[PDB]
Amino acid sequence: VTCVSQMPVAEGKSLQQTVELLTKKLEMLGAEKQGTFCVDCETYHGKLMYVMHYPLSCFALFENGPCLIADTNFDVLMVKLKGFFQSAKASKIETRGTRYQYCDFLVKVGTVTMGPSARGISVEVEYGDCWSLLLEFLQSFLGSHAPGAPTVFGNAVYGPADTMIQYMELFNKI
Amino acid sequence: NMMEYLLQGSVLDHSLESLIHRLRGLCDNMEPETFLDHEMVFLLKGQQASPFVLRARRSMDRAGAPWHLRYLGQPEMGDKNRHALVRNCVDIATSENLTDFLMEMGFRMDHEFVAKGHLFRKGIMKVVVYKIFRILVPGLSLSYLVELSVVAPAGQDMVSDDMRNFAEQLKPLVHLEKID
Amino acid sequence: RLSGPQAFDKNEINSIQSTEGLLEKIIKQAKHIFLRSRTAATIDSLAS
Amino acid sequence: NERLRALEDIEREIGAILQNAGTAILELSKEKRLLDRQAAAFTTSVQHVEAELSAQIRYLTQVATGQPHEGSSYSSRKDCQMALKRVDYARLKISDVARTCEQML
Numbered sequence: 001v002t003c004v005s006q007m008p009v010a011e012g013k014s015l016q017q018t019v020e021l022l023t024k025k026l027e028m029l030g031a032e033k034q035g036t037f038c039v040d041c042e043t044y045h046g047k048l049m050y051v052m053h054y055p056l057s058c059f060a061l062f063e064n065g066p067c068l069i070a071d072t073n074f075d076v077l078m079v080k081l082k083g084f085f086q087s088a089k090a091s092k093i094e095t096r097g098t099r100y101q102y103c104d105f106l107v108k109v110g111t112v113t114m115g116p117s118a119r120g121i122s123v124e125v126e127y128g129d130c131w132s133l134l135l136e137f138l139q140s141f142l143g144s145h146a147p148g149a150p151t152v153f154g155n156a157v158y159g160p161a162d163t164m165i166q167y168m169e170l171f172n173k174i
Numbered sequence: 175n176m177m178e179y180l181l182q183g184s185v186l187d188h189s190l191e192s193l194i195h196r197l198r199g200l201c202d203n204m205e206p207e208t209f210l211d212h213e214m215v216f217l218l219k220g221q222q223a224s225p226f227v228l229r230a231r232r233s234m235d236r237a238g239a240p241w242h243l244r245y246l247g248q249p250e251m252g253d254k255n256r257h258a259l260v261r262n263c264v265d266i267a268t269s270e271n272l273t274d275f276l277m278e279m280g281f282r283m284d285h286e287f288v289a290k291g292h293l294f295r296k297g298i299m300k301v302v303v304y305k306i307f308r309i310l311v312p313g314l315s316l317s318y319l320v321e322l323s324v325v326a327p328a329g330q331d332m333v334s335d336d337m338r339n340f341a342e343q344l345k346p347l348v349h350l351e352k353i354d
Numbered sequence: 355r356l357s358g359p360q361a362f363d364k365n366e367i368n369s370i371q372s373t374e375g376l377l378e379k380i381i382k383q384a385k386h387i388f389l390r391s392r393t394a395a396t397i398d399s400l401a402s
Numbered sequence: 403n404e405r406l407r408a409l410e411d412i413e414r415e416i417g418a419i420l421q422n423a424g425t426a427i428l429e430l431s432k433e434k435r436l437l438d439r440q441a442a443a444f445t446t447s448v449q450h451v452e453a454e455l456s457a458q459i460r461y462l463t464q465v466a467t468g469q470p471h472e473g474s475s476y477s478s479r480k481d482c483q484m485a486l487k488r489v490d491y492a493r494l495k496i497s498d499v500a501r502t503c504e505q506m507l
Contacts, residue, residue: 037363052361053363053364054357054361054362054363054364054367055357055367056357056358056361058358058361061275061278061279062278063274063275063277063278064274065271066267066268066271066272066274066275067268067271067359067361068240068266068267068268068271068358068359069265069266069267069358070265070266070355070357070358073263073264073265073266073358074265076175076263076265077245077263077265080226080245080263081226083222084218084219084222084226160360160361192462192464195464196464196465196470198471199464199465199470199471199472200465200467200468200470200472201468201472204473204477240355240356240358240359242355266355266358266359267358267359268358268359269359342467343465343467343468344467345467346462346463346466
């Protein structure tokens with residue numbers, strides 16, 4: 001499926017402390033480690049970028065995005081497109097973290113991109129629309145979460161770029 | 175980073191066998207094939223006064239193949255007796271995403287052309303024969319085109335002499351050269 | 355190049371190419387002896 | 403295909419033209435009927451053989467640069483060899499099964 005990411009602004013102890021608490025809860029759930037899948041999407045201008053893992057940097061800027069350019073295709077195109085887009089002043093940062101896989105699942109914690117940011121959680125599903133199981137698993141993870149806003153009224157058929165659209169919306173929201 | 179050594183080729187429309195058999199025999203490959211695609215040039219340059227071409231060549235006879243696009247221009251004056259080409263930068267695309275992004279970012283279709291012919295390859299080289307038509311979107315100059323081209327990193331222009339020798343090998347039929 | 359449009363994280367990036375040579379023949383011989391042993395065990399249990 | 407037969411016919415015609423020229427010279431120098439027509443035919447055949455040789459030499463010169471037509475479908479040859487080997491192994495196994503059945507009955 002394509003589970004959107006949320007921005008739970010935790011407080012009290014620390015941002016890193018809340019991230020460690022979420023990781024400890026996930027480990028208590030019984031999820032093993034599956035490498036560090038650091039996602040990266042930098043805005044530009046109304047252009048964008050993407051490094052979500054996958055050797056394809058697919059910048060879904062607008063009009064749902066192509067999401068087909070290679071890891072170096074869009075990058076070389078933007079590097080050669082000097083003078084066309086002169087809005088490179090406002091920079092953009094990206095998060096990182098780990099990636100666990102409990103069973104047919106995935107979890108990604110979105111840390112501080114440039115330093116100001118919350119712990120952005122993100123999950124996926126097995127086949128795909130099919131939100132009963134997703135919510136039943138999310139409620140056992142934490143409390144206030146699951147904003148939603150998917151590509152409703154589409155049938156798309158499990159749009160993979162929907163994750164990128166949710167990430168872009170979250171990055172613009174903070 | 176990457177570069178190209180594309181050479182221009184133009185053969186008479188009637189001289190087809192002396193090209194196909196020679197290329198199939200001298201050194202191209204085993205089990206040759208053909209192709210069919212149509213190009214869509216674009217340009218978006220308001221004040222820069224430098225229209226960048228984005229050839230979204232989509233193979234109509236392909237099963238949803240990506241719209242492999244290439245950027246070419248500003249031939250570098252190397253004077254290395256080579257094909258006198260410039261740097262290249264390929265870029266894949268999705269289904270109908272090339273037109274979608276061209277409409278989103280804003281582009282102007284300079285022209286539309288279609289190509290059709292046989293395919294050939296080499297070790298670090300590539301030669302292609304095809305014919306261009308002048309027809310509407312639903313579907314000619316009477317002159318085939320030998321697309322002897324090389325795309326590779328900068329290196330030391332070692333493939334230039336190899337391409338020159340390969341062109342001299344097919345001298346009785348055609349005579350490749352550069353272009354302006 | 356299909357990794358462009360259909361961006362696969364680690365499935366096709368690893369399935370595009372893999373090792374071969376002696377490992378394949380070894381696996382085939384292992385499967386052969388395993389099938390032979392299973393058939394022999396079934397035949398022996400039937401005869402017993 | 404046809405060029406080989408063409409060259410063979412050209413060589414045979416050159417030989418026949420030489421023989422006809424010799425015979426015409428002999429008949430004309432023996433004593434003094436059809437010697438004039440014979441000499442005319444011999445000269446015409448010699449000119450035709452020369453023209454055919456010049457045309458064959460002025461061929462398209464296919465490659466003249468390297469070993470052409472590289473690759474004689476070796477993959478298909480190997481595939482056919484493997485198919486024949488499969489057929490032979492199947493025949494051997496079938497003969498073994500038939501011998502076992504004959505020993506059974």
